[PDB]
Structures are given as C-alpha cells and as structure tokens.
C-alpha cells in the first residue's frame with residue numbers, strides 16, 4: 001500500500017530517557033530513539049528488539065507497544081509506518097559507535113530543538129503512559145505541513 005514498516009524504541013525510565021545522536025544518514029544530527037526497517041519474515045516486535053541492540057548495544061527484556069505514527073514526505077512515494085515501543089527493563093550499558101552517540105536525558109531536559117519536530121507533539125503522551133495514533137505530513141526534514149494525533153486504548 002506504499003507504506004514501509006519501521007520500529008522506534010524509547011528506553012524510558014522513571015526520571016530519564018535514553019536518546020541517540022545519529023552520526024549520518026536518516027535523522028543525522030538529531031537525537032532519536034532506536035529503530036529501523038522490519039525484515040522479511042520478522043515480527044515487528046522482534047525487529048524492534050533487534051534494532052535496539054544494533055543501534056544502542058542494549059538488550060531489552062519487556063517491550064510495550066505505545067503508538068503508531070505514519071510519516072509522509074511530500075514527493076516521496078513511500079509512507080513510513082512507524083511502530084513505537086517503550087521499555088524500562090534493559091540489560092547492558094549503552095554503547096557509542098561510529099553511527100550513534102547515546103546519552104541519558106532527565107525528562108524535563110529532553111532536547112526537542114535537536115529532535116525531529118513531531119517529537120514535541122507525541123512525547124507528552126509517551127511520558128504520561130498514553131498510547132496514540134499519529135500522522136505527520138512533512139515538507140523536507142524540518143516543516144510539518146499538517147498532522148493528526150489522537151490517544152487510543154489499543155495501538
């Protein structure tokens with residue numbers, strides 16, 4: 001249907017959240033959660049666990065579905081269908097790699113100015129343990145043309 005599955009994992013603990021600064025490629029220069037494309041024959045949740053490991057070095061125990069966000073970029077045919085998960089139970093220490101620099105942020109110091117602009121809209125919901133369905137239409141990397149965002153009981 002001209003949509004591609006992605007995952008996004010937020011390691012969200014009671015007073016802090018882990019974010020990674022991407023060194024190059026999609027989302028370079030921004031703090032973001034950990035995720036990527038889902039593979040053939042892989043469940044979305046299994047893909048989320050794999051991407052968390054690949055990008056942050058962390059092994060997640062329990063993962064919970066928190067949202068689904070569809071991203072449209074004008075002029076690009078494929079919609080990004082992003083399945084968002086959160087966890088507080090992880091193992092390992094975050095690893096800085098060529099591709100990603102990890103840092104913990106206190107919740108009142110989340111660096112929204114250095115994040116994708118849609119984050120400002122749906123992070124308030126994530127932090128209050130709400131679940132959501134969102135859609136954001138972007139022109140380029142920086143401008144939200146329009147959006148919808150609603151809370152839901154089931155993702």
Ligand SMILES: Nc1nc2ncccc2[nH]1
Pocket residue numbers: 008032033071116117118119
């Ligand atoms: N956290 C996050 N926000 C995003 N917005 C647009 C594309 C990818 C994104 N990842």
